[PDB]
Subunit: 345 residues, 4 copies
C-alpha cells in the first residue's frame, strides 16, 4: 500500500493570502503549467482540477497540459445534468486517448441551484442525485463500449455509442464523494474511489466503514481518498506560524465569527488539523499543520483507515507542491507513477 499523492491546480486563483487579492497571483496557462510540471516531476500521482463557474474549464485545462507532462494524471470533474452523458463519455475517451491513459474522473453533483439555473438545470436536492445516478450509469456503460438506449426520469438517449475506446480498462477511474446518505450510496454502487473530507481520524473512520459497508451490500469494494490542505514546515512553530500568516488578511469579523463557531486556535479541531483554511470557500475545509513527522504521522494514521489517495493543496500552489514533495514525501511510502509507453502504431 503505497500512497498516491495528488496536488491541486488552482484554476480559480492562487496566492499567499486567503480572502484577499493582496499577494494573489494571476492564474494563466503558463502558471498552471508550472504547477503541473512541478507535480509531474516531484512524483505526484496526479492533480485535481476543480469545477464551477468560478473556475476555468477543467477539461480544457487538463488537455492543455498533455504535451507538457508525461506521467501525471488529471482528475477532472464530471457534471451530470449540466451536460449530456454521451458527450461527456466521448470527451472522457478523448482525454484518455490524447494523454495516453492519464485521465481520472471525479463526479460532482451540483449543489448551487443558482449556478445550476445559470446552466439550464432546475432539479430539487433529490432529483439532482437521481439524475446523477442515471448519468453515471450511462456514462460508465458508454466507456465499456456499449450501445445504450436509456430512458429514465432525467436521462434519455437512444442508440448512444462511443466510436473511440478509452485507453484505461474497464474505463478511466471514477471518484465521487459526499457525506449525505444518498451520495454515499451512489459511490457505494458505481464509483471506484470514495473521496472524503479531512475530518478528525475518528469521524473519517466512521464514514469509511459506512461506505465500505454500503459498498459490500452490492458485492463491491471501493477505494478511499481524503482531501487535505497541507502546511508542512521544518518545525511545528513555523507550520502554525505559516497557518496564521495565511489568514492574516481575512476580515476581522470573519476571524471573530470563526472563533465563536468553534466553542468547546479554536480552529484546531484535532491535533494538527486546522480548520482555518475553510473560512473562505473554494478550497479544502481542513489543513494538516505541523512539521514533517507530525504531518506524516497524521497522514499515516489516515492511511491506516484504508485511504490510499491524498488530494493535497497549499498556498501558493507552485511553491507548496515543492514544500510537500520535499518535507513530506521522504517521510512517507509514496507511490511513484510511471511514464506510459507509447501505444503501438
Amino acid at each position: 500500500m503505497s500512497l498516491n499523492m495528488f496536488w491541486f491546480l488552482p484554476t480559480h486563483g492562487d496566492g499567499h493570502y486567503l480572502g484577499t487579492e493582496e499577494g494573489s497571483r494571476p492564474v494563466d496557462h503558463g502558471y498552471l503549467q508550472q504547477i503541473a510540471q512541478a507535480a509531474d516531476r516531484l512524483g505526484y500521482t496526479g492533480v485535481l482540477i476543480p469545477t464551477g463557474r468560478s473556475c476555468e474549464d477543467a477539461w480544457l485545462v487538463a488537455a492543455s497540459m498533455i504535451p507538457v507532462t508525461q506521467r501525471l494524471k488529471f482528475l477532472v470533474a464530471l457534471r451530470p445534468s449540466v451536460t449530456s452523458p454521451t458527450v461527456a463519455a466521448r470527451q472522457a475517451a478523448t482525454l484518455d486517448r490524447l494523454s495516453n491513459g492519464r485521465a481520472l474522473f471525479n463526479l460532482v453533483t451540483g449543489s448551487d441551484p443558482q449556478e445550476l439555473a445559470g446552466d439550464g438545470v432546475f432539479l430539487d436536492h433529490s432529483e439532482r442525485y437521481e439524475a446523477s445516478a442515471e448519468f453515471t450509469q450511462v456514462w460508465r456503460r458508454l466507456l465499456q463500449r456499449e450501445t445504450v438506449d436509456f430512458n429514465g426520469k432525467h436521462i434519455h438517449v437512444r442508440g448512444a455509442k462511443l466510436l473511440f475506446p478509452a485507453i484505461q480498462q474497464p474505463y478511466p477511474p471514477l471518484y465521487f464523494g459526499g457525506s449525505s446518505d444518498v451520495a454515499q450510496e451512489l459511490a457505494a454502487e458505481q464509483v471506484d474511489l470514495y473521496l472524503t473530507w479531512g475530518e478528525p481520524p475518528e469521524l473519517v473512520k466512521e464514514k469509511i466503514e459506512q461506505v465500505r459497508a454500503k459498498a459490500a451490500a452490492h458485492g463491491r469494494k471501493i477505494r478511499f481518498g481524503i482531501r487535505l490542505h497541507v502546511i508542512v514546515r521544518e518545525t511545528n512553530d513555523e507550520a502554525w506560524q505559516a497557518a496564521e500568516r495565511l489568514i492574516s488578511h481575512l476580515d476581522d469579523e470573519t476571524i471573530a465569527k470563526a472563533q465563536a463557531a468553534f466553542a468547546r486556535d479554536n480552529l484546531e479541531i484535532s491535533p494538527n488539523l486546522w480548520a482555518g483554511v475553510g473560512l473562505v470557500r473554494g478550497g479544502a475545509g481542513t489543513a494538516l499543520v505541523g512539521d514533517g513527522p507530525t504531518v506524516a504521522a497524521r497522514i499515516n494514521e489516515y492511511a491506516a483507515l484504508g485511504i490510499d489517495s491524498f488530494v493535497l493543496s497549499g498556498y501558493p500552489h507552485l511553491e507548496e507542491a515543492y514544500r510537500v514533495g520535499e518535507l513530506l514525501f521522504p517521510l512517507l511510502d509514496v507511490a511513484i507513477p510511471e511514464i506510459p509507453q507509447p501505444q503501438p502504431l
Copy 2:
C-alpha cells in the same frame, strides 16, 4: 486583402487513400501535433477541427495543441442542442484565454437524427435551426459579459453568466455555413463569417451575394470563406495523377456510380475543380487539382468573389500541408499570423 489560409486536423483518420484502411495512418496526439506545428510554422492562419461521433472531441484536441503552437488558431465546432450554451460559452472563454486569443468558433447544426438521438437530442429539421438560433443568441451574449435570462422554445437559462472574459473582442470570431435558406439567414444575422463549400465560381458567387444581401437586411456585413480540398503538384498531370491515385482503392461500384451521377473525369465539375474527393463522406466535397499557378488562379478567382478565408485539406494531411505551403503560398498573397504577446501580469 491578404488571404487567411487554414488547414485541417484529420481527427477521424488520415492516410494516402480514400475509402480504405490501406495506406491509412493512425491518428494520435503525436501525429495531430505534427500537423498543427507544421501549419503553425508554415504560416497558416489556423486549422479547422471537425465535429461528430466519428471524430475525437475538437475542443480537447485544440487545447492539447496550445503549448506546442504559438500563432496558429483553432476553429472548433460548436454544437447547439448537444450542449448547454452557458457551458459552451464558459469553455469558449477558457480556450481563448489559455491559447491567448487563438480560438475560433464554427457553429454546426446537427443533421444526423441518429447521431443527435445518441446525444439526447430529438428535434425536427426546423427545430434544429430554431434551437441553433436561440443557442447562438445566448452564447454570444454570454461572451459579451452579459448576464442572460432566456426562455425560448428550446433554450432556457436563468441568470447565466461567465465569470471569466475571453481575450478576443467582442468575442472570439464565429463562423457558420449552409446553403439552406434557413442557415443563410442564421449566418446573415449572427455569425461573422459565412463558410461556403467549393462549388464552381459562378455558383459560389450567387450564394455570397445572397448572404451578403441577407446580411445587409440586418444592417450587417459578414466575411466569407470557402472549404476546399487541394491536390497541387509541380505540373497539371502529376496533380490529376495524384487525384486518380487518391481514390484508386475505392469500391468499383462507387466509382461506377459516380460516373453515372455526373452525366452531361465526369468528376471535374469545373476546370480543375474535381468532385472525386466527395465520393466518401468525412472531408471536403470538391478539390482544386492542378499545378501551382492553376490552383492559385482558381483560388484568386474565389477571392475576387469576396472570400478572404480558405479552409484547405490534403492526403496525407502532414505532407500536404507542406505541399500547399510550398507550391501554393508563394503564388498567393497569404496573410501571415503573428505570435500574440503575453498578456500583462
Copy 3:
C-alpha cells in the same frame, strides 16, 4: 537481433532535389523539431546529426530537441583536434544527463585540411589519426570517472576530471567508421560500433570481417552499422522513378561525368543499390531503391552480415521518415525504443 533504425537530421539543408536550391526547404529549429518528433514517434532508435562548417552545431541541435522528444537518441559527432577532450567529455556528460541517457557519440576524424586550418588544426593525414586515438583515449577515461594525466604527441591534460557522471554505463556508446586501415584499427580498439558505408553486400562483408578480426586482436568484439539513403515506394518503378526525380536538377555535366565514372543506370552498382545520391557530397554515398520487400530484403541481407544498426535518410527528410517508417518498418524486425523512466530524486 532486432534492427535499430536511425534517421538523419539535415542540418545543412533539406529539399526535394539534389544539387539545387530549387524545391529546397529552409532548415530551422521548427523544421528540425518536426523531423526529430517524427522519428521519435515512428519508432526510430535515434538520429545522426552531422558535423562540419556546413552544418549547424550538432550538440546544440541535439540539446534543443530534448524537451520535445522522449525516447529518440541523438548520435552527434565528436571532433578530436578541434576541441579539448576534457571539454567534450564534460559536454558529453551534460547531453547524456539532460536527455536522460539518450546521447550517442560518433567520432569523426577531420579530412579537410582547409576546414581544420579554419579551426586552428594543422595535422598531416597521419597525425590526424594519432591525435584522434589520444583524444578518444582521454575522452573515454574521463567518462569512466577517472582523473586523467595525459601527455602524448598531440593531447596534453593534467588532472582532468568530470565532476558530473553520465547516465549510460560505462559511458555513452561510441561509434566510428572509415575504410582506411588506420581508421579500422582505431575502431577495432576503442569504439563500440563500427559504422560502414553502404557498399554491395559482398564488399560490406569483407570490411566487417576485417574489423571483426582487428577487434578480436584486442580481445574485443564490436557492433556494426551501415549508412544508407532510402528511396522506398509502393512499387519498384515508383522507387526508381523517385530516384531519377531526385537528381533531375543536377548539372548536365555532372550526370554525364557520373555515367563515364561507372564503366563496366550505371549508378546501380548492385541490385537496388543506386549511387546517384552520391553525385553531390553532404549525404550518403548509396541508396537502396525499390519497393518495400526488395528494400527489406537488401536490408536483411546486410543484417545477416552482422549489422544491427541502419542510419537511413531520404529527401525530403520529414516526409521520407514517414515513407520508410510506413513502407519498410512493417517488413522488418525493428527494435522499438522505450521512454526512459525519470531518474530518482
Copy 4:
C-alpha cells in the same frame, strides 16, 4: 532607461541552505526548465548560465531551453583558451539561430590554473588575458561574417569563416567583467556591457567611471550591469531573518572567521548590502537584503550610476524568481521582453 532584469540558472546545485547538502535540491533538466519558464513568464530579460567544471555545460543547457521558452534570453559563458574561437563562433551562431536571436555571451577568462590545466590550458596570469583578447578579436570578426587569418601569440587560425550568420546584428551582445585593470581594458575595447560586482554604490560608481573612461579612450561607450543576490521580503526583518536562515548550516568556523574578516552583521558592508552570501564560492558575493522599497531603492541607486542590467539570484532559485518578480518588479521600471516573430521562410 527601463531596467533589464536577469535571473540565474543554478547549474551547479540549488537549495534552501548555503554550504550544506541539507535542504538542497537536485538540479536536472526538469528543474532547470521550471526556473527558465518562470523567468520567461515573469518578464526577466534573460538568465545567466554559469561556467566551470562544477557546472553542467551552459551551452547545452541553454539550447535545451529553446523550445520551452519564448522571449527569455540566455547569457552563456565564453571560455577563451579552453576552446577554438572558430568553433565557439559557430556554436554562437547556432544558438542564436535556433533560439531566434535570444543568445547573449559573457566572456570568462579562467582564473583557476588547476581547472585550466585539466582542460589542457597552461597560461600565466597575463597570457590568460592576452589569449582572451586574441580569442575575442577573432570571435567577433567571425560573427560579422569575416574570413579571418589570425596569427597571434596564442590564437592561430587560417581562413576561418562561419557559413551561417547569427540573427542579432552586428553580432549577439557580449558581456565581460573584472576589476583588474587588464580586464577593464579588454571590456573597454571589445565588449558591449561591462558586468561589475555588487559593491557599495560608491565603489561601483568609481569602477564604472574608470571603464567608461577607458571605453572613451577607444571612441567607444559601453553599457553596465551589476551582479547581485536578492533576499527581498515583505518587511526588513523577514528579509534579514531570511538572510540569517540561509547561512544557518554553515560551518561555525566559517561564520566565526567571516566576522573577523569584517572588522571596522559585520557582513552588512553597506546599508542592505549583505556579504553573507559570499561565504561560500559559487554564487554572487553580495546580496541586497530588505523589503520591496528598500531593495528597489538600492537598485535604483545603482541604475542612477548608469547600470541598465541586473543579474539577480536567490535560494531556492525557482521560488525566489517569483519572490523578486512579485515583490520587486512592481516597484521598478522593468523592461519587458518581446517574443521575437518567426523569421520569414
